[PDB]
Design a protein around this ligand. Structure first.
Ligand SMILES: Nc1ncnc2c1ncn2[C@@H]1O[C@H](COP(=O)(O)OP(=O)(O)OP(=O)(O)O)[C@@H](O)[C@H]1O
Ligand SMILES: Nc1ncnc2c1ncn2[C@@H]1O[C@H](COP(=O)(O)OP(=O)(O)OP(=O)(O)O)[C@@H](O)[C@H]1O
Ligand SMILES: Nc1ncnc2c1ncn2[C@@H]1O[C@H](COP(=O)(O)OP(=O)(O)OP(=O)(O)O)[C@@H](O)[C@H]1O
Ligand SMILES: Nc1ncnc2c1ncn2[C@@H]1O[C@H](COP(=O)(O)OP(=O)(O)OP(=O)(O)O)[C@@H](O)[C@H]1O
Ligand SMILES: Nc1ncnc2c1ncn2[C@@H]1O[C@H](COP(=O)(O)OP(=O)(O)OP(=O)(O)O)[C@@H](O)[C@H]1O
Ligand SMILES: Nc1ncnc2c1ncn2[C@@H]1O[C@H](COP(=O)(O)OP(=O)(O)OP(=O)(O)O)[C@@H](O)[C@H]1O
Ligand SMILES: [Mg+2]
Ligand SMILES: [Mg+2]
Ligand SMILES: [Mg+2]
Ligand SMILES: [Mg+2]
Ligand SMILES: [Mg+2]
Ligand SMILES: [Mg+2]
Lengths: 463, 463, 463
């Protein structure tokens, strides 16, 4: 096996199966604005913070003052690290460069080296053979010195050659690719480990986000128990065999206006009533509209929000990508430590996105909720309000544990509502589909449609 | 006919119809990180291990120390082979190179030669005619010496020119292509024999995987008997004419929440009850959730797992490709030697993949199960819970031998379940569709819906 | 008109409408491994064998020893032809080359000349004008000498320029293109005559295969009679007005598990019972599984196979392309001389292929069966087991003469089977759809569903 230096970057050590190999060069290639400089800075910063390993950052484009000023936005005080001698910033804006880097490593006992852009040096030569030869010389000398080095290079096209000259991949022992894919006028950041000589790794592209704390890569044994939480509606708990499970994931799917937001609001209100903290992520309604609707339902969200029990986070789905929404949800969960989380609509997050990306987002959110033992209440909007046979437009049914189905039923020329417990993993539940009503006091559950047939199609026939 | 030297690489001799021709050059071309160095190392290593044939590995990019260090991750002690004189590693980091290779072949009685990258030598020349001339000289000299040589070259594009200069294919007698296709943010490794002068071979691309033992290529007369195994449910055995066949493949397809995992769990529990070893591959639920659900069904998986009778392997479908899942399943089957294997969901493995790839995966798994005389229990999730007419979204019905159909039936405003034996190859089975119930004691099978019509559509009408 | 020299290559003279023009140059262009060398060798070999016309093969890449060694795999003893003086192999690994070729033609009285690769000579020049001028000189001199010449050139892209320099097409009188198209990870060989100056030809691409006998091109007045063969089921013969026709093509289409393989097995068993030879091509089941299923049906295939009456050929559809399957079927038919041929499933061959290619394959197989007066029993699997309205997923209904329809019918909560004679060309047949049963003694045909309506949809209603 090969010893691996943990980069301590969130999620990178998972895909790399223990981190970057010790003493081997890693080349991170990407287009402008992908996060190469941030990756190289965070490598050294996390190394210094977690293991006291000195770092040397050799820069070519940005001045050291610019590097420190940019890092200050992340809370990283690189200036005090330079004063303490833990971090060194070499200015290089090839043999002499390697000699100076070696001298810096010797003087500061550096364990990690970062090279901001070797491409700027290679700009002086047009032949790819010369670039390959000089990169091989640099990598060989770095390996001989024994310092783990992370160099970054530039790309012209997202889906094309891995590097500018097409020969950098064949030289470096380790290759990592940062991509900023523009599709549907939306930008998505992806990370892909192309080649790790001598060790296994995860294969493919995984989304990552840049936040105030740096890079947060999402590298896509959950515990279970018999403790049952209360949804908030007594009939909905009786139908579920004694309420939802603590670790369960509940998905309430139905057409617009069937009462998904009402169930979400009752879930949050019941969470806060038992002195538990709850988070409500809203994507179809604003905070004031939610307050007015809750007041129409006889529920005071203002009092529970003043007590810091309920946190309502409202944003438009189009304001950020799905991975950004996942990162925001995770950050809010970490900051607030909630017992329950609810989402106003997954279909709102599903607007204008591919099925695979939405499924990945749902899998990530549900896995994080189960890992943190947080009761999650997701909701989904069906495209057709009657005659729908697919539970969800994007198949996420297998992911969830408990499913609630809300639908419209046309009876006597009136649009009544029907609610049913579609499935519950590990628990008995009522199979009947029952009439669902909404009034000033909230939701009510009535008897089932025993006298009707073809109820699922939305246009039943009395028999 | 042409004599062929067996490469002993798993699956390569099947597609090459006996191995690489003796005394002829084979050029393996691919992009960075496809497995060219691994292929060339494994060729010589397997030759030495299986036939005591000495091997010579000429390297250009990696140092011999790097080669040995990388090989050590596979358990290949190349250093002791160098000490024993069976393996030689020439360092070349063109006529002089050929003279040194010939001297190494003469001194060590080499039978196999591997060339890591002739492209690095060709980098010195830009004209494709010069590259073609020098490659022809090298191949002609290698043929004159009589050593079977495997050279590797580099590619820039996966679907484009076969080699960097576009002339390497017209020189070498044998051409093999390694591709690392990136599609849907997922990487897939493929192997394609382009041209074998003088001999037949399989045509097209076949998936291969890199594991701790090296390359495991999957090159996509099964025996039958009348011995009948027990599923675990007595009614499901009565309906099947006395249980499933030992060599049969059973596919239980239905909507979410119909009871596929219950049948899989009963299958595994009955396998382990008769002191047989069983494997359960889970993709929709974790180990703890499976344990809790089994406990809710009155089945103790913990006791049977402590006895090393049941092996539960749980992973996310998105963590690896379909060929990787097939390799993992095969490795677990080889390590555990199970009588029965069960899969929690094929549709989970079918997320975000093409129909052809999923069908190939199913064909491979079923063929391996039948070849090893292992009773396999596959399950499939239908997109629509009612009104579905296609048995499976991806047509794999022809592959399977026995099919069980689970469906939802809306009767009296309640979602009951129906189970039916769709087909059984070589055995009589009950044609009735019977009511299916789930309780604390497990599954129950009741009388059929004799009084209803259009049961298949999911919304029957009492007649 | 122009006199044409028959190349004697199987299927080439059909598309070329009598062969290559005499005294005119033909340039065959294709990528690596398409079959250019094989085409040029087979041209001279077939000329010598069939008309005693001496041939001269001028080679540039392969040595004459390599050429003979490669040809020996096809059974072509080129060495004895060189000794006899019928064949000459000139080694050239431009004016001097033409002088030597002319001397060889004069000395050996050569009538056909083949040039393995003029592209290798043209590699010395980069200007396309020089290549065009020298190729024009070569073609003009060859025409002046009066020898029919087949030169081959190289291509970089399958769908792009016809030749490397883009000027070879405008020089040569005749242009032929060999393509090796890679699509869906599958390779397909195609042949296309681009331009024949002065004569007509077939237009477009036609599949061809390379086998142990060389190139077998498939260039896509059938006789009829009133002799009626017996299917094997007496009721199925009564319904068909006295059995199938000898020259008829029968297609039995239905869902999985309806009994297509049972009908195929009964067809083969009845063929062999009357001392006729029969061939069964299996693609969904192995030989042992077929034997076990036949034994369950009371039919002993082993005894009839020992008598060399029945030949069972089993293979996976994914092991070869559709044209390869057609070639294998034709070769087996030629070797065994069968009275009847049966196919276990056309839909198995239809996996992962385009509709047009499958239709071409079906047309070819049916035309060959009708031309050879062989009774063919094809079968097709429908995607939907109920409610299907298209007879076949890929429309091949017009091709066939007799159609049998098998379907599932849900009656009284049980999945019964229905069989119907959809159509019969030139013969009266029963229009009723009758109940179909399978038991230990085989198939049984019962009364029709006179009391039901909407039987075709699979969910009838008693009236
Ligand atoms: N505090 C921050 N919060 C959020 N995003 C930030 C923050 N600081 C920087 N970024 C983002 O980091 C991205 C990458 O910045 P970086 O300096 O690493 O560029 P780069 O990938 O090295 O590019 P180049 O080589 O073209 O200079 C920028 O596009 C910017 O949007
Ligand atoms: N005071 C009230 N009395 C009766 N019904 C009410 C009252 N307030 C709201 N409703 C009902 O609430 C329904 C909408 O419920 P909800 O806010 O949960 O929406 P939803 O089903 O989640 O869909 P979406 O947010 O996409 O519109 C409306 O159709 C309306 O009939
Ligand atoms: N022990 C291992 N387990 C799993 N995968 C491994 C292991 N060792 C190496 N690999 C994989 O083998 C792949 C190919 O490695 P290899 O050294 O053969 O590269 P290559 O195809 O010759 O590339 P290049 O010519 O760019 O150097 C790497 O991308 C790596 O992911
Ligand atoms: N103790 C129990 N009593 C009654 N029913 C139960 C019990 N435990 C589970 N169930 C039933 O099991 C059903 C789900 O069964 P199972 O775990 O086999 O799922 P499945 O059909 O394979 O689908 P998926 O895993 O995709 O959700 C639920 O709908 C629920 O009604
Ligand atoms: N006995 C055989 N059986 C089956 N296929 C064969 C046999 N002999 C040769 N082939 C096939 O013939 C194909 C073409 O071989 P050939 O020597 O004609 O190459 P080519 O088209 O002239 O290529 P190039 O110009 O690159 O050398 C090979 O790819 C090989 O797979
Ligand atoms: N001994 C038997 N008794 C009764 N029915 C039998 C017997 N053996 C087989 N069958 C029936 O044969 C059916 C399958 O028939 P067959 O082998 O012809 O398949 P098919 O319709 O060609 O489809 P496929 O090969 O795609 O599964 C099964 O549904 C089963 O009910
Ligand atoms: Mg920069
Ligand atoms: Mg809402
Ligand atoms: Mg290498
Ligand atoms: Mg399940
Ligand atoms: Mg050739
Ligand atoms: Mg069959």
């Amino acid at each position: 096996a090969i010893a691996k230096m943990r980069t301590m970057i969130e999620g990178f050590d998972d895909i790399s199966h223990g981190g970057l190999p010790i003493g081997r060069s890693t080349l991170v290639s990407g287009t402008s604005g992908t996060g190469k400089t941030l990756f190289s800075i965070q490598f050294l910063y996390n190394g210094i913070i977690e293991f006291d390993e000195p770092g040397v950052f050799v820069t070519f484009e940005e001045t050291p003052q610019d590097i420190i000023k940019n890092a200050r936005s992340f809370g990283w005080d690189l200036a005090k690290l330079v004063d303490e001698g833990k971090l060194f910033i070499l200015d290089a804006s090839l043999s002499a460069l390697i000699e100076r880097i070696n001298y810096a490593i010797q003087k500061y006992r550096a364990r990690r080296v970062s090279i901001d852009s070797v491409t700027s040096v290679f700009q002086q030569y047009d032949a790819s053979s010369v670039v390959r030869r000089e990169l091989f010389r640099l990598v060989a000398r770095l390996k001989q010195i024994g310092a783990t080095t992370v160099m970054t290079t530039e790309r012209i096209e997202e889906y094309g050659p891995i590097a500018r000259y097409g020969v950098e991949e064949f030289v470096s022992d380790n290759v990592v690719i940062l991509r900023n894919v523009l599709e549907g006028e939306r930008r998505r950041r992806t990370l892909e480990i192309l080649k790790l000589r001598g060790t296994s790794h995860m294969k493919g592209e995984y989304p990552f986000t840049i936040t105030d704390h740096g890079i947060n890569i999402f590298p896509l044994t959950q515990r279970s128990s018999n403790v049952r939480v209360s949804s908030g509606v007594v009939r909905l708990d009786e139908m579920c065999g004694g309420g939802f499970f603590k670790d369960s994931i509940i998905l309430a799917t139905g057409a617009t206006g069937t009462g998904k937001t009402l169930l979400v609001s009752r879930f949050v209100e019941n969470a806060c009533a038992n002195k538990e903290r709850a988070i409500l992520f809203a994507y179809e309604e604003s905070r004031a509209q939610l307050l007015r609707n809750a007041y129409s339902w006889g529920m005071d969200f203002e009092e529970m929000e003043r007590q810091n029990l309920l946190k309502i986070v409202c944003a438009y789905p189009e304001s950020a990508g799905l991975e950004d929404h996942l990162q925001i949800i995770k950050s809010e969960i970490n900051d607030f430590k909630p017992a329950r989380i609810a989402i106003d609509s997954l279909s709102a997050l599903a607007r204008g996105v591919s099925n695979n990306a939405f499924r990945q987002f749902v899998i990530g959110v549900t896995g994080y909720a189960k890992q943190e033992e947080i009761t999650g209440l997701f909701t989904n909007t069906s495209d057709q309000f009657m005659g729908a046979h697919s539970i969800t437009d994007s198949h996420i049914e297998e992911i969830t544990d408990t499913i609630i189905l809300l639908q419209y039923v046309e009876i006597r020329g009136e649009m009544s509502r029907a609610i049913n417990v579609f499935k519950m993993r590990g628990s008995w539940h009522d199979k009947a589909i029952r009439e669902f009503m909404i009034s000033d006091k909230g939701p009510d559950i009535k008897d089932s449609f025993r006298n009707f047939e073809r109820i699922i199609s939305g246009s039943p026939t009395r028999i």
